[PDB]
Amino acid sequence: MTKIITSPSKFIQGPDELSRLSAYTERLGKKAFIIADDFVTGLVGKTVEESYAGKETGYQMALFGGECSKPEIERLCEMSKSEEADVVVGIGGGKTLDTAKAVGYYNNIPVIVAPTIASTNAPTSALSVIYKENGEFEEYLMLPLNPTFVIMDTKVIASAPARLLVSGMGDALATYFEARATKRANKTTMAGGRVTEAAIALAKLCYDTQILEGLKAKLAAEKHLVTEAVEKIIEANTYLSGIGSESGGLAAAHAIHNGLTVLEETHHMYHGEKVAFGTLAQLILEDAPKAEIEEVVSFCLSVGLPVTLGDLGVKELNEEKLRKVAELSCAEGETIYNMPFEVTPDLVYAAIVTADSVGRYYKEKW
């Protein structure tokens, strides 16, 4: 009967926020350990360095090898202890951010994650995805706490390709539907309890913000510009969707995202792009009203999110392959069982292929 909502201790957003990084690390400790890969070090290194003017013994940069692996986490933990760091910062993509969270967990120090893109709802979450050094998935490392601070430098984020912001809209699109399903089912979330009113409200605002703001935000982000629409979408893609999914629940869309790994042609598509199509499949599965489906498909077409298997690179519907997608989506502990009805591979197969038919249908009609 327990309800839980979890959060970063602070979520901080604005243009040129990395220029105040020292003000934020100073609130948590005397000595920051700042992890970033080659590209991101060149991108933001000067801004970070300039932030610590007059405080120059209060940080050190560390070059990240690019993979969130156990060896790389151990190497950075040792360097961090060796430099006597009492706060860790990750700046970059998901692999960098997760590495920083892992380092903070192992060394027992607070963490700051500062994404340079807004393409998934992972940044706020109490989770590091660990890989082997060769790039294969190893494990999900569940953290006791969400990262202490999440910092969104909207100026840096807007310099990323717009495809990445749009992909974050796709990821954000699933949040309300998955949370609604989980709450309807009376099932539990990654936060470890049943769904709070706060989390479902944030999930709902997430969805509404995508519909109202996504297109306006895309048109600005294509030119690498920051408007208030871009500000609202960055918040929705990160905080709203992050709290919404972790404390509101995942369901069929994420499970279907995972199952699509079977289709090799879809590996070139980003996480949120595949989640967008998984959302359409969830809506068929739960048989959402045609009006709700049309609003989602319409939004996806307006911003360039996929609504067919074709849009994910799949040139031919293959029954054998699509069965495997459905089977993998329904594996033992998958999130698809948070739907408030019984689910089978046949039913998920039907949802996926019919989602593809619905997408094709509306593309041709509009």
Side-chain angles (χ1 to χ4, degrees):
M1 274 173 46
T2 304
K3 299 158 232 58
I4 304 174
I5 184 168
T6 69
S7 175
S9 189
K10 306 196 195 303
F11 167 89
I12 294 148
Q13 180 181 322
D16 212 10
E17 242 21 88
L18 289 179
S19 80
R20 291 168 223 92
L21 179 54
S22 69
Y24 300 117
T25 66
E26 292 299 340
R27 295 188 199 183
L28 298 171
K30 282 76 208 211
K31 180 73 189 289
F33 183 77
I34 300 176
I35 303 164
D37 69 15
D38 191 61
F39 180 81
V40 175
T41 300
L43 188 67
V44 310
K46 207 161 192 289
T47 305
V48 170
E49 286 174 15
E50 286 181 321
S51 170
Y52 289 94
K55 304 284 170 52
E56 301 206 11
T57 58
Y59 85 106
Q60 276 195 252
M61 301 292 292
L63 182 65
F64 177 55
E67 191 61 83
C68 181
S69 66
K70 294 284 184 151
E72 181 66 4
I73 291 159
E74 192 207 316
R75 186 181 78 77
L76 296 164
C77 285
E78 285 286 325
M79 290 172 62
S80 176
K81 289 202 204 84
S82 163
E83 300 166 26
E84 300 177 44
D86 61 355
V87 56
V88 51
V89 183
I91 311 178
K95 286 178 195 291
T96 305
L97 302 184
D98 289 0
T99 299
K101 297 184 218 174
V103 168
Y105 171 57
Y106 291 119
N107 291 12
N108 193 49
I109 55 175
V111 183
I112 300 185
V113 298
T116 55
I117 69 196
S119 60
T120 81
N121 62 13
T124 56
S125 75
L127 181 57
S128 303
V129 184
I130 311 295
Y131 298 81
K132 293 180 146 53
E133 298 175 288
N134 69 344
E136 295 180 41
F137 170 82
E138 183 178 354
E139 58 160 325
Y140 293 120
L141 179 57
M142 314 294 182
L143 304 172
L145 299 174
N146 295 76
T148 324
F149 299 172
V150 181
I151 294 176
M152 308 306 284
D153 192 318
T154 56
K155 190 199 191 158
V156 171
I157 292 157
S159 87
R163 188 182 173 200
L164 285 164
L165 189 70
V166 170
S167 192
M169 302 177 198
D171 211 35
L173 203 57
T175 308
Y176 177 58
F177 300 113
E178 296 197 289
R180 186 173 68 181
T182 300
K183 194 172 198 292
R184 260 170 204 170
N186 203 48
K187 291 282 174 75
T188 59
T189 70
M190 289 303 296
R194 297 190 301 129
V195 178
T196 57
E197 295 309 314
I200 195 66
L202 293 176
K204 175 58 182 159
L205 182 66
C206 179
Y207 178 73
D208 291 347
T209 305
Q210 299 303 324
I211 300 308
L212 295 169
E213 306 286 305
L215 177 60
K216 288 189 284 168
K218 181 179 171 159
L219 293 172
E222 282 177 331
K223 301 292 195 284
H224 308 291
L225 306 166
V226 182
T227 64
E228 175 61 14
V230 176
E231 293 280 339
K232 284 180 186 157
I233 282 298
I234 286 173
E235 187 190 334
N237 287 8
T238 312
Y239 192 80
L240 304 184
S241 180
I243 307 315
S245 56
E246 189 186 56
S247 297
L250 296 64
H254 270 69
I256 291 163
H257 158 276
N258 292 352
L260 285 163
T261 195
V262 169
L263 301 176
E264 51 216 44
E265 317 103 289
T266 71
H267 293 166
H268 83 280
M269 305 303 292
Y270 300 132
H271 188 100
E273 293 172 332
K274 288 176 296 217
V275 169
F277 175 79
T279 304
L280 180 56
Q282 183 174 316
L283 297 176
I284 303 305
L285 179 61
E286 62 176 279
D287 188 44
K290 188 160 69 83
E292 208 162 80
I293 291 163
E294 284 174 20
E295 180 169 273
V296 169
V297 175
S298 180
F299 170 72
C300 290
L301 294 170
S302 77
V303 300
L305 285 171
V307 300
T308 67
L309 291 167
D311 295 346
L312 306 180
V314 185
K315 301 205 164 167
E316 291 210 41
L317 289 32
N318 185 279
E319 171 165 15
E320 191 169 52
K321 294 279 178 59
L322 288 167
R323 294 269 164 205
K324 290 169 202 289
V325 172
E327 263 133 45
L328 188 52
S329 305
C330 299
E332 200 152 293
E334 270 291 6
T335 63
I336 202 152
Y337 300 106
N338 289 333
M339 296 308 290
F341 44 85
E342 179 165 335
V343 177
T344 66
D346 281 1
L347 207 54
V348 176
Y349 182 82
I352 292 162
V353 173
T354 303
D356 177 80
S357 308
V358 166
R360 287 179 79 265
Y361 172 85
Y362 284 114
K363 275 173 62 173
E364 223 146 63
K365 186 168 182 276
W366 291 338

